[PDB]
Design a protein around this nucleic acid. Sequence first.
DNA 1: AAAAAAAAA
Length: 899
Amino acid sequence: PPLDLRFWAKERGLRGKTYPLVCHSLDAAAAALVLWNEYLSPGLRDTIASSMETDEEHAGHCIAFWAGLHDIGKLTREFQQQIAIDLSAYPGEELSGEQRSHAAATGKWLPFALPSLGYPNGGLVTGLVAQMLGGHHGTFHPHPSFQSRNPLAEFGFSSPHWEKQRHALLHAVFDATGRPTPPDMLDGPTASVVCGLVILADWLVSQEDFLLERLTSLPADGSASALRAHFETSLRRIPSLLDAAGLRPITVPPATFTESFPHLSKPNGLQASLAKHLPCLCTGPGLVLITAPMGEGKTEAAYHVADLLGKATGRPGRFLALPTMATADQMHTRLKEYARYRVENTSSTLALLHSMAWLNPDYAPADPFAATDWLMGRKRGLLAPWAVGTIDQALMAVLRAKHNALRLFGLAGKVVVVDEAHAVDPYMQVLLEQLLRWLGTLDVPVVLLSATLHHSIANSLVKAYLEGARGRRWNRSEPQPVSEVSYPGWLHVDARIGKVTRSSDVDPLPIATTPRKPLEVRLVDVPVKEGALNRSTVLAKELTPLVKQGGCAAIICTTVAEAQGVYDLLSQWFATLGEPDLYLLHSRFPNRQRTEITATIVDLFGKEGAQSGRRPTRGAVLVATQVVEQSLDLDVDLMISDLAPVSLLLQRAGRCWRHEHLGIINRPQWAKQPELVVLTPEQNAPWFPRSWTSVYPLALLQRTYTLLRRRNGAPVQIPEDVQQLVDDVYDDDSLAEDLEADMERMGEELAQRGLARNAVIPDPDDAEDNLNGLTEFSVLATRFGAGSVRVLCYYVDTAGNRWLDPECTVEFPEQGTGREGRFTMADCRDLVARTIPVRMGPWASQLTEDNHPPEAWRESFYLRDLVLIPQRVTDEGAVLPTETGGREWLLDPCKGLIF
DNA sequence: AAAAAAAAA
Ligand SMILES: Nc1ncnc2c1ncn2[C@@H]1O[C@H](COP(=O)(O)OP(=O)(O)OP(=O)(O)O)[C@@H](O)[C@H]1O
Ligand SMILES: [Fe+3]
Ligand SMILES: [Fe+3]
């Protein structure tokens, strides 16, 4: 029949005009086709068409055709009546009162009209294909159940009229994408990825510019050719939409190590053995597990590994996963330059992905690889050709929430690399395994970078990759894929056969790293007052040789109020000198402050301060919480930690003479050997302050302590005794002599790993025929725990007006400085910098209205959920600690927040 | 009682 163009698909923002539903549908079908050819990785396209068991011109045409049917659900009365419309020639199909999403309806009508064209009635293919189109807005719906023999009617689709036009529309786009015949196979994992494709497509033709332009040349009627005109017009315009979005693939030409990295003069022992023995092993899709110490160039190795795996799997896309927004920021630069160096001269962006990437002004817009607008959008990030972000951005592809199959699509065409794997806790590990699981089944090649990593984990990781690859999980009988991990050393995994080639099997060197002097480890007992450590005594003793001959020392404390006491203690102790330098650094400083301290600190004690002689010849001490453990270019002559689990101590203590080998540092006399003094309480099973049992499992401290007393002051070889210490503290049972406390630890780990299984999507086997499991729940974390809120201290005079400074001269912003007083990214960036991150606890449940921000701010994503912390200021101008949610707060200039 | 991450069509 002649398909009437009165049926619309868009009304929003057209200035009273409407866009016909055929036209939106074709547009989508075009965009989906273009995508297929020009955007998707070659190796991806193959994985999909292979899983459909077909050729690609065909595969992309079926995909082209489907994607056009995504909004067919809009052809119901419930949807089209919303705006003014004359449906006098379409009686019947009266309102139900159900209010079905058009998407759902699409998923509902499709499985009983697709066989018209050749699809298996009840065929898993028809099953999957209509389910994934019905989920074209990021929620999947269950396969339609029905009791009669005429479900098209059971589901509402009952008018002969309306049903011809649904068919006309069905038929129109069938004609356009070339009447493609149904594939034989299609499964869940492929179909969710194909979902992402359709979604990206619905988005690209949904923009107002595109639409308003197409709005000037609407075909005059439903004729197969008026429509073939339009389908061809849109076919023509989509590529320029890719270019606006910075979507073109970043393609790097094959090269050696030395060619890729001209600048790097000498390859690393590790690097030489990778660049040599991997080209052969990279037969196709598979996994590389690299593991080695700090500063051993793994990033550079990684960029390379990726490229071999890149050619092997038709995958130029890049995602590099990092443990913090910080380490991501830095690495964004490292890869942007690597791209400028490597790309052939001849508009594809390179993305920064984390919550804060708007507040970076060197990234976000107001150059090739420059971030574009469109790509700045909310879930899009992972759709960029290359991209570097936090690991959380990727695990969000395997939690159960909306658009996780967009997130999957993005990850699919790329090589993916996660650094500092060792970082992840039990909760995140479980999330990762399942990502690795789903990437396994999807032919995406994977790189894992780490420092020393415990074996159980390494096993579990690659095991997950292989369970995904082959399509069946592991047996209790089946012989574990990993039994020992070598530090340093690498490891390759093949998809085709699941062969775990180690380093020791392809080459016997052993891998060369930096040579460095054995670390001293000194258990030092400490007296106890009121449950916590009084350290006054032992501090005067260990840092007396600093106050005399100079030096660089670092004191690490388990908690924040601790390292604040240990700063006061030290601070008074220099007021007596009176004429070393003294620094404090934890998580509780306003962002603005935290940065510059970090800056000063990685200048003095950093590698750039030895090379520039800026390293302080007078004594210098730093007092830190576990902030030290992440991303700090430091080097200290002496270090003194409180006990932690060994894994953390050995990384806390990687800083000591981290740049000794450069021989560009004179160490003080007293600084004989690289030393870690480790505080511990004096006893009366081993016991610890509650504040240590609170952050670390009592059992884990107790083991670590005993694992050290088992050496009696013997030194730790590096990098040779490190892996045996990380494996053993967990593995040995004989280190545990409190069993209640050591069973609590194992229970608490179950707790976390358990919660994570509840967050995650299904194992791909289980999603073989049913996508509905993917987005179904009843906000999900990428991290176990209560989390942090951000607080902003405002100051209040007795009037009391509100100020941003204790000097009460910068009025509190009731408004912004953009047009109409809206807040801006520049405005938020400024504002956010005075906010400080405070761990959720009972206090946040007792928040009065003067802790809840101005109404102007509720309209801003960054500012919306800020908690305001008042700090009263006297008439004589003094900051008093102030009541807020049942605890006294005081932002101190030199110490940070204090509650 | 640590640190760490976290409106679309
Ligand atoms: N041949 C080489 N040997 C040692 N270092 C090198 C070499 N070539 C370059 N470097 C530099 O050494 C540093 C090594 O740090 P890299 O970026 O590899 O991180 P890493 O400490 O090795 O591991 P991670 O990625 O976890 O930080 C880099 O700054 C790199 O510029
Ligand atoms: Fe839709
Ligand atoms: Fe749509």
